[PDB]
Design an enzyme around this catalytic site. Structure first.
Site, PDB file in Angstrom:
ATOM      1  CG  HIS B  73      35.936  13.915 108.731  1.00  0.00           C
ATOM      2  ND1 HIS B  73      35.877  13.413 110.012  1.00  0.00           N
ATOM      3  CD2 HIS B  73      35.144  13.114 107.979  1.00  0.00           C
ATOM      4  CE1 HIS B  73      35.090  12.352 110.034  1.00  0.00           C
ATOM      5  NE2 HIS B  73      34.633  12.149 108.812  1.00  0.00           N
ATOM      6  CG  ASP B 229      32.232  10.621 105.694  1.00  0.00           C
ATOM      7  OD1 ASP B 229      33.155  11.308 106.182  1.00  0.00           O
ATOM      8  OD2 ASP B 229      31.656   9.714 106.336  1.00  0.00           O
ATOM      9  CG  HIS B 252      35.158   6.568 102.932  1.00  0.00           C
ATOM     10  ND1 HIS B 252      34.934   7.919 102.761  1.00  0.00           N
ATOM     11  CD2 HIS B 252      35.075   6.336 104.263  1.00  0.00           C
ATOM     12  CE1 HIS B 252      34.719   8.480 103.937  1.00  0.00           C
ATOM     13  NE2 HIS B 252      34.800   7.542 104.865  1.00  0.00           N
TER      14      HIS B 252
END
Ligand SMILES: CCCCCC/C=C/CCCCCCCC(=O)O
Ligand SMILES: CCCCCC/C=C/CCCCCCCC(=O)O
Ligand SMILES: [Cl-]
Ligand SMILES: [Cl-]
Ligand SMILES: [Cl-]
Ligand SMILES: [Zn+2]
Ligand SMILES: [Zn+2]
Ligand SMILES: [Zn+2]
Ligand SMILES: [Zn+2]
Ligand SMILES: [Zn+2]
EC number: 3.5.1.108
Lengths: 266, 266
Positions: B73, B229, B252
């Site tokens: 973030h 993200d 991720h």
């Protein structure tokens, strides 16, 4: 039994499960015949059924413009230890929820008991009684001792189960924490409640999963907590109770409805 | 674009969504050609892919025995504002989650930008590339500007939807908060994570209900956050990126897998 109070002030503090606000309690000793009463902004609110002002998701009391939310857990503990004369000073709008059970309250009050000079005038159930509502049911009958049974019929994995408390088994229910099904949380939050709720003070149960990493303390911790609640709501009768109760899916509302019936009759 | 840094130290503090521990950040200004790097217990951890040590539920970096969790973030915000030289001092083991989005970070950094003396050396995607895994897919191709699209296929009510970010639309994604489906929470908690999670920093989505009383900021806040993200994970390439990305159900892990491919190739 002899009326009891505390040997000295005992205080507790924390957030309120519903308000989300910080709050502190201060249990003060009181002389014989005083009774259990709360104190807030200069007003004394007797721990009696006539002062109940709300029963959804908690039992709340109020008087002369002053309200205190969620009195069931501290009253339950007071009912179990048979403390009869104390002034619960409240700095805030709700009783601190703490870990969700009556453990902390119980441990502190238990070793600060002071027997007084007068026999307890127990509220004794004299005849059988039943109060129903939307399938939920609570039954009460005469008994020399306080006996409470709670039977639940849950839509999730807990399924159907019951638990019974008898005098002497205090510790089997003082640890049972507060619980809620995930499917109810959205409602609680929408109606301005449960602002202080978290997995640290509430056991969140899914349709077949326990969210809390610590799991359940007892396979039936939920119904044990229900007994804990009922016992607290019963103390609103004004004095330690002696009777045999059976609650099928009961809740604060029905509990109070019962309390009022009993008082009315006698 | 010219390399940028801050006009003065900027600090943020709060709990970590995963550790549950308190933590504080302190963004320090740095001279040209420095790059983005974190600092913890005397160790400098470059915000680069070679230092990624974990990618499940967060992108974590580590070096010489020192680790920092959830850097996505703050890096995303830094990537969007094109800040290129700063030392993110970390007091704790994770970046404060704050409200779950990049709003606070963005607002503070945005009005403390200091242009420096050097053209930014952008990482430019030179040829097309695709990285797949268990149905998830991310594609990247050449572009003069940073363009990121995220398409999700959700098992709950969100169903299927996508969102596209183009330079100039920073504010459409800096508010999008972190989200999680109720059905995943038990796992997160069991593997020792999500200890700082709450409805105050996470949008909990049910099979067809939003638990948070505040509801969604956008009907597609989830996929917007996914873009947020990805943009943060891309900055691990070492410098502001210029390319067109399309992510179908990425996360991720895939994001980083892509980052490494790109770096490797060039
Ligand atoms: C922020 C994260 C999550 C968990 C939120 C828990 C939801 C709050 C539920 C309120 C419980 C109300 C029942 C208590 C009454 C009682 O025990 O007598
Ligand atoms: C039912 C009650 C509970 C609410 C508890 C909230 C749990 C938080 C889960 C952890 C979120 C992990 C995703 C964060 C990573 C990211 O946004 O990049
Ligand atoms: Cl209700
Ligand atoms: Cl508390
Ligand atoms: Cl954040
Ligand atoms: Zn309600
Ligand atoms: Zn309770
Ligand atoms: Zn510093
Ligand atoms: Zn996992
Ligand atoms: Zn995120």
């Amino acid at each position: 039994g002899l009326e009891k109070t505390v040997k000295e002030k005992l205080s507790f503090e924390g957030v309120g499960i519903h308000t989300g606000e910080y709050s502190k309690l201060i249990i003060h000793p009181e002389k014989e015949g005083t009774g259990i009463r709360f104190f807030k902004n200069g007003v004394y609110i007797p721990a009696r059924h006539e002062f109940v002002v709300h029963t959804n998701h908690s039992t709340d009391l109020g008087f002369k413009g002053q309200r205190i939310k969620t009195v069931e857990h501290i009253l339950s503990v007071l009912h179990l230890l048979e403390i009869t004369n104390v002034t619960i000073e409240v700095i805030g709008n709700e009783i601190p929820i703490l870990d969700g059970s009556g453990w902390e309250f119980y441990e502190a009050i238990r070793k600060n008991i002071l027997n007084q000079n007068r026999e307890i005038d127990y509220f004794v159930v004299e005849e059988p009684i039943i109060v129903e509502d939307e399938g939920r049911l609570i039954k009460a009958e005469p008994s020399d001792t306080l006996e409470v049974t709670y039977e639940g019929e849950f839509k999730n994995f807990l399924g159907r189960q019951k638990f019974t408390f008898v005098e002497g088994n205090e510790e089997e229910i003082v640890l049972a924490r507060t619980f809620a099904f995930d499917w109810e949380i959205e409602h609680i939050k929408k109606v301005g409640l449960g602002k202080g709720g978290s997995l640290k003070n509430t056991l969140v149960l899914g349709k077949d999963k326990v969210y809390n990493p610590e799991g359940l303390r007892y396979e039936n911790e939920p119904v044990r907590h229900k007994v804990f609640d009922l016992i607290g709501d019963l103390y609103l009768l004004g004095s330690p109770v002696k009777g045999k109760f059976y609650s099928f899916r009961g809740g604060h509302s029905l509990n109070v409805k019962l309390v009022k019936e009993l008082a009315k009759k006698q």
